Design an enzyme around this catalytic site. Structure first.
Site, PDB file in Angstrom:
ATOM      1  N   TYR A   1      30.110  44.250  36.772  1.00 48.46           N
ATOM      2  CA  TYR A   1      29.792  43.755  38.111  1.00 48.46           C
ATOM      3  C   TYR A   1      28.542  44.345  38.733  1.00 48.46           C
ATOM      4  O   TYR A   1      28.133  43.880  39.805  1.00 48.46           O
ATOM      5  CB  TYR A   1      31.010  43.917  39.041  1.00 48.46           C
ATOM      6  CG  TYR A   1      32.180  43.211  38.421  1.00 48.46           C
ATOM      7  CD1 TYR A   1      32.240  41.825  38.418  1.00 48.46           C
ATOM      8  CD2 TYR A   1      33.154  43.918  37.737  1.00 48.46           C
ATOM      9  CE1 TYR A   1      33.276  41.149  37.781  1.00 48.46           C
ATOM     10  CE2 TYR A   1      34.187  43.261  37.100  1.00 48.46           C
ATOM     11  CZ  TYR A   1      34.249  41.886  37.137  1.00 48.46           C
ATOM     12  OH  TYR A   1      35.280  41.221  36.506  1.00 48.46           O
TER      13      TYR A   1
ATOM     14  N   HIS B   1      42.609  38.651  31.060  1.00 45.93           N
ATOM     15  CA  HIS B   1      43.814  38.768  31.874  1.00 45.93           C
ATOM     16  C   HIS B   1      44.637  37.492  31.935  1.00 45.93           C
ATOM     17  O   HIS B   1      45.792  37.549  32.372  1.00 45.93           O
ATOM     18  CB  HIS B   1      43.460  39.166  33.307  1.00 45.93           C
ATOM     19  CG  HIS B   1      42.764  40.478  33.403  1.00 45.93           C
ATOM     20  ND1 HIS B   1      43.319  41.652  32.946  1.00 45.93           N
ATOM     21  CD2 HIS B   1      41.544  40.802  33.894  1.00 45.93           C
ATOM     22  CE1 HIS B   1      42.475  42.647  33.151  1.00 45.93           C
ATOM     23  NE2 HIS B   1      41.395  42.157  33.731  1.00 45.93           N
TER      24      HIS B   1
ATOM     25  N   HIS C   1      39.118  47.372  32.217  1.00 47.25           N
ATOM     26  CA  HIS C   1      40.475  46.983  32.565  1.00 47.25           C
ATOM     27  C   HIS C   1      41.281  46.676  31.311  1.00 47.25           C
ATOM     28  O   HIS C   1      40.743  46.254  30.281  1.00 47.25           O
ATOM     29  CB  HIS C   1      40.458  45.738  33.446  1.00 47.25           C
ATOM     30  CG  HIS C   1      39.760  45.938  34.750  1.00 47.25           C
ATOM     31  ND1 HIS C   1      38.430  45.618  34.939  1.00 47.25           N
ATOM     32  CD2 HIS C   1      40.204  46.424  35.932  1.00 47.25           C
ATOM     33  CE1 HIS C   1      38.086  45.904  36.181  1.00 47.25           C
ATOM     34  NE2 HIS C   1      39.145  46.391  36.807  1.00 47.25           N
TER      35      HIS C   1
HETATM   36  C1  LIG Z   1      41.679  44.141  45.358  1.00 44.90           C
HETATM   37  C2  LIG Z   1      41.137  44.522  43.977  1.00 44.90           C
HETATM   38  C3  LIG Z   1      42.258  45.247  43.227  1.00 44.90           C
HETATM   39  C4  LIG Z   1      40.646  43.306  43.199  1.00 44.90           C
HETATM   40  C5  LIG Z   1      40.069  43.645  41.852  1.00 44.90           C
HETATM   41  O1  LIG Z   1      39.400  44.666  41.697  1.00 44.90           O
HETATM   42  N1  LIG Z   1      40.252  42.773  40.782  1.00 44.90           N
HETATM   43  C6  LIG Z   1      39.756  42.776  39.527  1.00 44.90           C
HETATM   44  C7  LIG Z   1      40.393  42.175  38.469  1.00 44.90           C
HETATM   45  C8  LIG Z   1      39.836  42.140  37.198  1.00 44.90           C
HETATM   46  C9  LIG Z   1      38.576  42.675  36.917  1.00 44.90           C
HETATM   47  C10 LIG Z   1      37.985  42.728  35.593  1.00 44.90           C
HETATM   48  O2  LIG Z   1      36.831  42.978  35.381  1.00 44.90           O
HETATM   49  N2  LIG Z   1      38.849  42.657  34.484  1.00 44.90           N
HETATM   50  O3  LIG Z   1      38.378  42.761  33.215  1.00 44.90           O
HETATM   51  C11 LIG Z   1      37.932  43.265  37.983  1.00 44.90           C
HETATM   52  C12 LIG Z   1      38.488  43.310  39.240  1.00 44.90           C
HETATM   53  C13 LIG Z   1      39.564  42.491  43.935  1.00 44.90           C
HETATM   54  C14 LIG Z   1      39.737  41.153  44.281  1.00 44.90           C
HETATM   55  C15 LIG Z   1      38.745  40.421  44.924  1.00 44.90           C
HETATM   56  C16 LIG Z   1      37.524  40.991  45.232  1.00 44.90           C
HETATM   57  C17 LIG Z   1      37.310  42.313  44.876  1.00 44.90           C
HETATM   58  C18 LIG Z   1      38.309  43.040  44.232  1.00 44.90           C
HETATM   59  K   LIG Z   2      39.955  47.179  27.873  1.00 46.95           K
HETATM   60 ZN   LIG Z   3      37.123  44.377  33.781  1.00 45.69          ZN
END
Ligand SMILES: CC(C)[C@H](C(=O)Nc1ccc(C(=O)NO)cc1)c1ccccc1
Ligand SMILES: [K+]
Ligand SMILES: [Zn+2]
Ligand SMILES: [K+]
Length: 358
Positions: free
Chosen positions: A305, A135, A174
């Site tokens: 996760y 990202h 994602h």
């Molecule tokens: C509020 C929510 C929208 C946010 C979230 O899910 N972010 C997020 C971004 C990228 C990945 C990933 O794995 N990208 O590859 C996974 C999760 C979030 C923020 C803080 C603590 C929990 C959750």
């Molecule tokens: K992907």
């Molecule tokens: Zn992811």
């Protein structure tokens, strides 16, 4: 050795965490549990241990702006209050005094494997790195990422090793919009992402995560998004996507290096991904990528996760990197109706650029 699988891991990858949210999913246990399971399964000892290194400024500048790099460097001296204020200028990130140092080693781990694989000192490799990268953008953090590990690695392979064509396969749940943006106009780096989308309901909520975003300019045709619009996708949905769409395009593109944004948040049990992919599926997906680029394949950890699910997915991928025969999967491999709809739509958007899709 020349037929070996490299593995990069350093303790520094555990030396940062979210200071203001003890339940934050992107945490040090992600990588230590992977390493513990690789050892428990007897796979770690079958790999060639490769040292990490810190990325240099010049390497970062292949992708990132000087002003952004300098700002990120300055975070190592900030107070918690300053770190939080800066982190809140971005979407879905935290900061920590050790984040920058670990991020530099995270990039460098991938570059080390690129060196060994491109020179035939190893066949393939996997970096067990955090923070993730896909990202991160030219001038901003995003989505738990500071620097775009794989985008840097792709431009590094081209500049240092003189590679002409790189394929990036992103199977994290994602969309790696950072990678898409970096290579939007670039036909020399083909980016393929399969990701949960739900017509924008799922983070990062971008119109450009749909399959209509095919790249632009000279890069038209060289960006391929496969958005899922229902939760619960399984191994058969991913394997079908690779068989109908990714493999035909990859063989036509003829990459000289394959980089994988190897997130495991699509695995069953992930707390965020919403998918039902067995960890063993990743043995098959890894195997399906080894037939291009002379097997020059480097995986780098992105998301994932559930500590056990992510470790199992890494181990399944590693078994294929090491050449072990793929397991039988219990399901038939047939996709669901929703997956087929998404695959067909992506093919419809990309067909005007790939003879293999016509
Ligand atoms: C509020 C929510 C929208 C946010 C979230 O899910 N972010 C997020 C971004 C990228 C990945 C990933 O794995 N990208 O590859 C996974 C999760 C979030 C923020 C803080 C603590 C929990 C959750
Ligand atoms: K992907
Ligand atoms: Zn992811
Ligand atoms: K591209």
């Amino acid at each position: 050795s020349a037929t070996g699988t490299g593995l990069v891991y350093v303790d520094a990858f555990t030396r940062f965490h979210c200071l203001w949210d003890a339940s934050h999913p992107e945490c040090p246990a992600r990588v230590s549990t992977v390493m513990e399971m690789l050892e428990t399964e007897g796979l770690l000892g079958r790999c060639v241990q490769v040292e990490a290194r810190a990325v240099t400024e010049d390497e970062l500048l292949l992708v990132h702006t000087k002003e952004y790099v300098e700002l990120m460097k300055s975070t190592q001296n900030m107070t918690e209050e300053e770190l939080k204020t800066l982190a809140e200028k971005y979407d879905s990130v935290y900061l920590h005094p050790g984040f920058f140092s670990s991020a530099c080693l995270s990039v460098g781990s991938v570059l080390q494997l690129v060196d060994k694989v491109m020179t035939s000192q190893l066949r393939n490799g996997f970096s067990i790195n955090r923070p993730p990268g896909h990202h991160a953008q030219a001038d901003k953090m995003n989505g738990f990422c500071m620097f775009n590990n794989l985008a840097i690695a792709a431009r590094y392979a081209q500049k240092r090793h003189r590679v002409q064509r790189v394929l990036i396969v992103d199977w994290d749940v994602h969309h790696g919009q950072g990678i898409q943006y970096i290579f939007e106009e670039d036909p020399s780096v083909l980016y393929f992402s399969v990701h949960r989308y739900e017509d924008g309901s799922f983070w990062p909520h971008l119109k450009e995560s749909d399959s209509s975003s095919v790249g632009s300019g000279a890069g038209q045709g060289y960006n391929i998004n496969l958005p899922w619009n229902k939760v619960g996708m399984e191994s058969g949905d991913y394997i079908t996507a690779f068989q109908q769409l990714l493999l035909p395009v990859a063989y036509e593109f003829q990459p000289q290096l394959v980089l994988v944004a190897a997130g495991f948040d699509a695995v069953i049990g992930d707390p965020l991904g919403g998918m039902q992919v067995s960890p063993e599926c990743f043995s098959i997906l890894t195997h399906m990528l080894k037939g291009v680029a002379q097997g020059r394949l480097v995986l780098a950890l992105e998301g994932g996760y559930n500590l056990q699910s992510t470790a199992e997915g890494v181990c399944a991928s590693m078994r294929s990197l090491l050449g072990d025969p793929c397991p039988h999967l219990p399901s038939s491999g047939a996709p669901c109706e929703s997956a087929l709809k998404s695959i067909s739509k992506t093919i419809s958007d990309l067909y005007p650029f790939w003879k293999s899709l016509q």
